[PDB]
């Protein structure tokens, strides 16, 4: 059954709760973003109302084949009414179309559900600043002080300079970027822009990108692999074997690969700066690991919550074991004692 952390009190709403069949009482199912864990269970066979951003609606329509009658897209930053209740969707700074949802309950309680998010100080000057939030449903993916990472802009700058150097040294080098869902598009779009190239990719991936309301998209991406010097492949192919195999397929148009694996955190965040990063190399193939995160670091999450000063926190990630919940509660109490709420 649907856990209490996916239910919004004193409404019949749920959030990211599609894997439990019919939820008893639920009149509206909200979807924060188009990542498989959150949408798990949605298909062309679903027959209840789904509320979401315009981008998430495009993806539901085109990728999952959910029938149009059940998709209720809402604009961002706009007060809307859903089944008698005031809501606002806000940019989550996660992947394309990802939202936080603000729910203004009839009794006067205000609830923020973050979805998946990367907390940022620009969120301190949104509609959130206008009133007290009593309850926060929080993306606790990286809720532990070991999780640090550079800014997105630091990582992109590094990727750009690296790629530009490599292809100026060898104009027959190919650049490959690994990918598995939506998100982290800036990695490949920024590398292509410095090289004066479009991004080549499979038909299914191109179809996905064509849903995302990216300006001038047709000038940036193609299904003609031949004509482009940045290619997208599945993350699983980003290794020496998969990459040599791909190089054989391109028909001697390239003689070297430089590949990037955008990852979350891995243990080498605890010593290395982005400027110290060096690739793994075998022959004419080099693979760079780059920690491009679309989740809050510990410090970013701590700052947002200490600013917001919620009266109660409901974790939505790592809630499956008592040890994780206990550990998280410890950090929430520390933050509250430091900040005086
Ligand atoms: Ni996500």
Curated annotation (Swiss-Prot):
Induction: During mitosis. The mRNA encoding this protein contains an internal ribosome entry site (IRES) in its 5'-UTR. This 5'-UTR generally suppresses translation while specifically promoting expression during mitosis, when cap-dependent translation may be impaired. Expressed in brain, heart, kidney, liver, pancreas, placenta and skeletal muscle. It is found in: Nucleus. It comes from the Eukaryota. Binds constitutively to TP53BP1. Binds CDC27, which is itself a component of the anaphase promoting complex (APC). Binds PIAS1. May be required for DNA interstrand cross-link repair. Also required for checkpoint mediated cell cycle arrest in early prophase in response to mitotic spindle poisons. Possesses beta-lactamase activity, catalyzing the hydrolysis of penicillin G and nitrocefin. Exhibits no activity towards other beta-lactam antibiotic classes including cephalosporins (cefotaxime) and carbapenems (imipenem). Belongs to the DNA repair metallo-beta-lactamase (DRMBL) family. This is DNA cross-link repair 1A protein. It comes from Homo sapiens (Human).
């Amino acid at each position: 059954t649907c856990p209490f952390y996916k239910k919004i009190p004193g409404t019949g709403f749920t959030v990211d709760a599609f894997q439990y069949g019919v939820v008893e009482g639920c009149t509206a199912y909200f979807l924060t973003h188009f990542h498989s864990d959150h949408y798990a269970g949605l298909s062309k066979h679903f027959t209840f109302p789904v509320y979401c951003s315009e981008i998430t609606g495009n993806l539901l329509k085109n990728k999952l084949h959910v029938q149009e009658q059940y998709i209720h897209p809402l604009p961002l930053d706009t007060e809307c009414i859903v089944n008698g209740v005031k809501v606002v969707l806000l940019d989550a700074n996660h992947c394309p179309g990802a939202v936080m949802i603000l729910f203004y309950l009839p009794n006067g309680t205000v609830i923020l559900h973050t979805g998946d998010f990367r907390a940022d100080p620009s969120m301190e000057r949104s509609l959130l600043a206008d009133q007290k939030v009593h309850m926060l449903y929080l993306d606790t993916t990286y809720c532990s002080p070991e999780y640090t990472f550079p800014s997105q802009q630091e990582v992109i700058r590094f990727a750009i300079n690296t790629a530009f150097e490599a292809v100026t040294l060898n104009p027959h080098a190919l650049v490959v970027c690994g990918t598995y869902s939506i998100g982290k598009e800036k990695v490949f779009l920024a590398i292509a822009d410095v090289l004066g190239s479009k991004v080549g990719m499979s038909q299914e991936k191109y179809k996905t990108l064509q849903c995302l309301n990216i300006p001038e998209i047709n000038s940036l991406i193609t299904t003609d692999m031949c004509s482009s010097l940045v290619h997208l492949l599945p993350m699983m192919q980003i290794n020496f074997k998969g990459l040599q195999s791909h190089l054989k397929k391109c028909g001697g148009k390239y003689n070297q690969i430089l590949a990037f694996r955008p990852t979350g955190w891995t243990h080498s965040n605890k010593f290395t700066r982005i400027a110290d990063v060096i690739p793994q190399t075998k022959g004419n193939i080099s693979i760079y690991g780059i920690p491009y995160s679309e989740h809050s670091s510990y410090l970013e999450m701590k700052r947002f919550v200490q600013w917001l000063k919620p009266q109660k926190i409901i974790p939505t990630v790592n809630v499956g074991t008592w040890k994780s919940r206990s550990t998280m509660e410890k950090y929430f109490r520390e933050w509250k004692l430091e900040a005086g709420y």
